[PDB]
Assembly symmetry: C2
Homo-oligomer: 285 residues x 2
């Protein structure tokens, strides 16, 4: 099959190389720290001695390092060896850095595809993998078959920063939800309730994750019907959360933050509308 | 069946009275603003004239208004009639306000039950109905059958404010999650991405065990990072820098950042994100 190069042998990089090898790709690997490829070489991987030698061994080069600052530090020595090849940046960073990488890649004659892995390494090489991809459509189709070895490719568009945008946007949701759960856990924990007793209920407050698409209809329509629950009614509930958190001894930074956003919308005349109307103030720094 | 009184005929109050009427309970209803009981009265409801007659008409009095100050203003005239009866307060408020109501009820000779409706009005009367209850166990056992008309009773304990604490905490999670989703929708929208195209992916990330898994790290006090708070914080930095460049407000993600920085300054950057609970506490 097509030869592929994985630059960076961390937890994810090692999984990526393994998935390429399992699909029959002659995989050339390289890492700054030696002693992490023993399992890959036993499966067929060729350990390269130089980044430039690794970049020159395959038509497709996948780089999976911590940030782009590292990606640019590793690949500058081989910046020209990227000649005529495609760089698949599966490093997670900002949309701006993905666009600067693309321009940097074009400067050195290389094609560029920006990717974002949305699963842990164990799920690479399996149908559970969700990898976003953005950049020139032709380049994706030309290498879609090779990238299938990693899992579920999902082309988003031509803008190199799209994949990163989806990435930071989905991590924005995940960590913000994370913080709310931990705050709720602490609040009930102030009265001795084990988190194991609150967790089955915290699963029910979300029931089917339908709200995602119900509110998306409002956002896309720009119409936030405040029928039933209004933003001002919801804001009253936040006040109860803040005063309960204060009374119970828990920090009230996060709930006050959500309260500030609600007030901003109410100050913009959305008091009557739904909570989804808070997006109107979220779009204004 | 047992007679029941419903004080407050807003969307929820009318749903509660209808659920009692369906279960065969003789239901007396009453509300400050007239003209909302026609459907209930056609199904058997008895519209009381005064709140003191309504309170006096039933052994079980269910009050469901906007807040605690409203219940205290609308029952203050009939505080004497409450003696010997049971006030089941389904009005959502703070745990402290729940403990105060129980005391006020006791001073007037009434048993008190604090409740928290976690479902919308349409779900009342249905198996999906989730209503938390707290207060003395005996009073709840005396009226479990009558309260079953409203749906899934979940008796939490004896503390009158316990049901309200579960209430605020689940709402803390719900609204915080809502805020994060809107911010993520705004972030993808800065590049024209329709919220309807993002919703399917937002679901895939949520794939529901993260609640129970962290509950054990929180119960054990052991936050093993392998993902560590230090790395997670660097991604939250990317969210802020990206949002600022994309023209999106950074207040909310920065609030999340301040929380991870607090736990890091406490010596948890090598623990899990779950360890944030320690600074929350
Ligand atoms: N759960 C996951 O693991 C997961 C899931 C989705 C996405 N990702 C993304 O995938 C990428 C890889 O993550 P990871 O799990 O492998 O851990 P990581 O610590 O983010 O990256 C480890 C890799 O980066 C290399 N590296 C970092 N800084 C370097 C530098 N200055 N010079 C040279 N190499 C450098 C490491 O080299 P050494 O090995 O020599 O130290 C190693 O190969 C990250 O961008 C991460 O956000 C990870
Ligand atoms: N319906 C829901 O979606 C839902 C779901 C779960 C929990 N809850 C909670 O359960 C309760 C039901 O709320 P709701 O949806 O019915 O609407 P609401 O606006 O929260 O409650 C309004 C009710 O309280 C009365 N009221 C409010 N302020 C009053 C005052 N100052 N003096 C006298 N009466 C006053 C209203 O009388 P008027 O009708 O005359 O204005 C009406 O009966 C609330 O505590 C809510 O937080 C509601």
């Amino acid at each position: 099959n097509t030869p592929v190069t994985v630059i960076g042998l961390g937890p994810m990089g090692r999984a990526l190389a393994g998935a390429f090898l399992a699909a029959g790709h002659p995989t050339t690997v390289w890492n700054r720290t030696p002693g992490k490829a023993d399992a890959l070489v036993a499966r067929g991987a060729v350990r390269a001695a130089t980044v430039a030698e690794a970049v020159a061994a395959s038509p497709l080069v996948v780089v999976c390092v911590t940030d782009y600052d590292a990606m640019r530090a590793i690949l500058e020595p081989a910046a020209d060896a990227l000649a005529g090849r495609v760089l698949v940046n599966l490093t997670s960073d900002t949309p701006e850095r993905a666009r600067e990488a693309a321009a940097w890649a074009a400067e050195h004659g290389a094609d560029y595809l920006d990717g974002a892995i949305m699963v842990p390494p164990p799920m690479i090489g399996t149908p559970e993998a969700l990898i976003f991809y953005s950049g020139p459509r032709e380049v994706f189709e030309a290498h879609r078959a090779t990238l299938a070895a990693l899992g579920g490719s999902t082309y988003l568009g031509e803008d190199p920063g799209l994949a990163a945008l989806y990435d930071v946007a989905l991590l924005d949701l995940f960590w913000t939800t994370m913080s709310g759960y931990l705050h709720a856990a602490a609040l009930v924990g102030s009265e001795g309730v084990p988190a194991a007793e609150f967790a089955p209920f915290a699963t029910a407050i979300f029931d089917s994750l339908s709200f995602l698409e119900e509110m998306a209809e409002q956002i896309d329509a720009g119409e936030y019907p405040g029928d039933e629950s209004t933003l001002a009614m919801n804001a009253a509930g936040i006040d109860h959360i803040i005063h309960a958190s204060r009374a119970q001894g828990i920090d009230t930074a996060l709930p006050e933050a959500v309260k500030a956003l609600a007030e901003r919308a109410i100050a913009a005349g959305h008091g009557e509308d739904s909570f989804t109307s808070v997006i109107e103030v979220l779009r204004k720094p």
